């Protein structure tokens, strides 16, 4: 809802932004392993998958991290602060 | 910060997770273009860069979108407490 326009005045000027990424749980399927576990909630940020921190990672990176463990899946999740 | 373990009982099972990613402003440098702008803040979720939706986009692809326009950076951002 907020429009931002940042205009450089010199070629080597920086914007001053450090942009990062959060992978989060958008939805949990009914009656699923995730739903029946109880500890994951929609909105949760995924901080760690199968022992590897996920920050700055892409969904493609997470997919291979998830597929690394064949039958099982370990994560660290954290509540969305504004839930 | 909650450790979660999901265990499948069949190979064809699913965990039941729809995961997504948001790009967000992790830091704004002091005395920078971003610092002086009224409309952009640490914590902001970036919804669009230079006219392109960034939902689920990797930081690598976000970097190429930013580099595409030499001199100016347009975004749509949302307050973290609004997402």
């Amino acid at each position: 809802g907020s429009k931002v326009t940042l205009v450089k005045s010199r070629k080597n000027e920086e914007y001053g932004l450090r942009l990062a990424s959060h992978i989060f749980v958008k939805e949990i399927s009914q009656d699923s392993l995730a739903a029946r576990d109880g500890n994951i909630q929609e909105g949760d940020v995924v901080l760690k998958i199968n022992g590897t921190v996920t920050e700055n990672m892409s969904l493609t990176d997470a997919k291979t991290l998830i597929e690394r463990s064949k039958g099982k899946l370990k994560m660290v999740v954290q509540r969305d602060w504004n839930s | 910060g909650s450790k979660v373990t999901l265990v499948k009982s069949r190979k064809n099972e699913e965990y039941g997770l729809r995961l997504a990613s948001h790009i967000f402003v992790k830091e704004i440098s002091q005395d920078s273009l971003a610092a002086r702008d009224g409309n952009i803040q640490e914590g902001d979720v970036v919804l669009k860069i230079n006219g392109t939706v960034t939902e689920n986009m990797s930081l690598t692809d976000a970097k190429t979108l930013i580099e595409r326009s030499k001199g100016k950076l347009k975004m749509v951002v949302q307050r973290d407490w609004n997402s």
Partner: peptide
């Protein structure tokens, strides 16, 4: 964050 560097612009 780790292993994947941040994006600084």
């Amino acid at each position: 964050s780790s292993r994947v560097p941040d994006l600084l612009v």
